[PDB]
């Protein structure tokens, strides 16, 4: 609830009101950095910004523009603006800002400026300095080992915000969303699920309600009994514990 709105008017007020950007005069507010887990945050609260106007979305895979000689990439900048010119502030949704095929380490093998040959030219040429009609960019990625120290100026990552994985009570929010269109009795103590649940991931609590229906396929439950969710936590959360490579942090 704090981050529905902290991202809202930092995008809304510059696009709705460009006239205050001549009452003092600076064009520059070009969006926040959404960093944290994968979870459901990257895809779902992007649709929370879609609540008023918004729409646009499109998609930025962060891969088809990152071709090496940037004479093509600068055309691949303005190729995406062929639809962003068709409107008012178009809202270029951008997925996996910092993600390449595989992993990204420091400056050794191909974990290099292949982003930053494109990336520092985007914030120059997409919007802000070279711009058209107060289009808004929304940076969002969760990996980033190497970054620009000049990215922290007002005009690239004007304000940053971190997404956290647990709440133990926004579980129950996301739980009752996924305990929605599934047939049951209303027999469910939903907090008795949550206290026995240890998932700590919003995308993986989606998997918990999925496997509880698999326990409902078991023993011929057209409904879902309250035991099936307790069966589901012991199957899903144990499968989460049995995976290695547990070092990931966005910078």
Q: Which residues bind other proteins (CB under 8 A)?
A: 10, 13, 20-26, 28-29, 61, 63, 67-70, 96, 99, 101-102, 106-107, 110, 113, 117, 150, 153-155, 158
Give the nearest distance from C-beta 137 to other proteins in angstroms. Answer: 16
Considering the complex, state which of residue 112 and residue 225 has its C-beta at the smaller distance from other proteins. 112
User: Does the annotation list 78 as a binding residue?
Assistant: no
Considering the complex, state which of residue 102 and residue 181 has its C-beta at the smaller distance from other proteins. 102
User: Does the annotation list 53 as a binding residue?
Assistant: no
Which residues partner with 137 through β-bridges? 92
Give the nearest distance from C-beta 23 to other proteins in angstroms. Answer: 5
Q: Helices 114-125 and 70-84, interaxial angle, to 10°?
A: 40
* Distance between CA atoms of residues 46 and 117, nearest Å: 26
Nearest CA among 211, 229, 224 for reference residue 172 = 229
Length of the chain in terms of residues written: 251
* Distance between CA atoms of residues 165 and 4, nearest Å: 16
Considering the complex, state which of residue 56 and residue 73 has its C-beta at the smaller distance from other proteins. 73
Considering the complex, state which of residue 37 and residue 188 has its C-beta at the smaller distance from other proteins. 37
* Distance between CA atoms of residues 224 and 237, nearest Å: 19
Residue spans of beta strands (DSSP E) within the chain: 33-35, 91-93, 136-140, 160-162
User: Does the annotation list 47 as a binding residue?
Assistant: yes
User: Does the annotation list 41 as a binding residue?
Assistant: yes
User: Does the annotation list 131 as a binding residue?
Assistant: no
Nearest CA among 232, 192, 238 for reference residue 212 = 232
User: Does the annotation list 85 as a binding residue?
Assistant: no
Considering the complex, state which of residue 13 and residue 192 has its C-beta at the smaller distance from other proteins. 13
Which residues partner with 136 through β-bridges? 91
Give the nearest distance from C-beta 62 to other proteins in angstroms. Answer: 10
User: Does the annotation list 40 as a binding residue?
Assistant: yes
Give the nearest distance from C-beta 200 to other proteins in angstroms. Answer: 15
Query: Which contacts (CB < 8 Å, 24+ apart) does range 75-83 have?
Result: 77/121, 77/122, 77/125, 77/126, 81/126, 81/132, 83/58
User: Does the annotation list 43 as a binding residue?
Assistant: yes
Which residue in this structure is represented by tokens 């030219």?
Answer: 121
Considering the complex, state which of residue 44 and residue 87 has its C-beta at the smaller distance from other proteins. 44
Give the nearest distance from C-beta 3 to other proteins in angstroms. Answer: 16
List the binding residues.
39-44, 47, 95-96, 142, 153, 156, 178, 201, 206
Binding-site residue ranges for ATP: 39-44, 142, 153, 156, 178, 201, 206
**Residues within the annotated binding site for ADP?**
39-44, 47, 206
Annotated binding site for Mg(2+): 43, 95-96
């Amino acid at each position: 609830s704090e981050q529905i709105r902290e991202l809202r008017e930092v995008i809304e007020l510059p696009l709705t009101n460009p006239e205050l950007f001549q009452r003092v005069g600076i064009i520059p507010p070009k969006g926040c950095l959404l960093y944290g887990p994968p979870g459901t945050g990257k895809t779902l609260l992007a649709r929370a910004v879609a609540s008023q106007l918004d729409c646009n979305f499109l998609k930025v895979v962060s891969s088809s523009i990152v071709d090496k000689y940037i004479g093509e990439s600068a055309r691949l900048i303005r190729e995406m603006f062929n639809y962003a010119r068709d409107h008012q502030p178009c809202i270029i949704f951008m997925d996996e800002i910092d993600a390449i095929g595989g992993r990204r380490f420091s400056e050794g093998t191909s974990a290099d400026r292949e982003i930053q040959r494109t990336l520092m030219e985007l914030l120059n040429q997409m919007d802000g300095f070279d711009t058209l009609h107060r289009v808004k960019m929304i940076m969002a990625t969760n990996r980033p080992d190497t970054l620009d120290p000049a990215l922290l100026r007002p005009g690239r990552l004007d304000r940053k915000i971190h997404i956290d994985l647990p709440n133990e009570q926004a579980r129950l929010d996301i739980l009752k969303i996924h305990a929605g269109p599934i047939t049951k009795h209303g027999e469910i103590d939903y907090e008795a699920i949550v206290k026995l649940s240890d998932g700590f991931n919003g995308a993986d609590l989606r998997n918990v309600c999925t496997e509880a229906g698999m326990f409902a396929i078991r023993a011929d439950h057209d409904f879902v009994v309250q035991e099936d969710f307790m069966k589901a936590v012991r199957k899903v959360a144990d499968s989460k514990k049995l995976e290695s490579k547990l070092d990931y942090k966005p910078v």
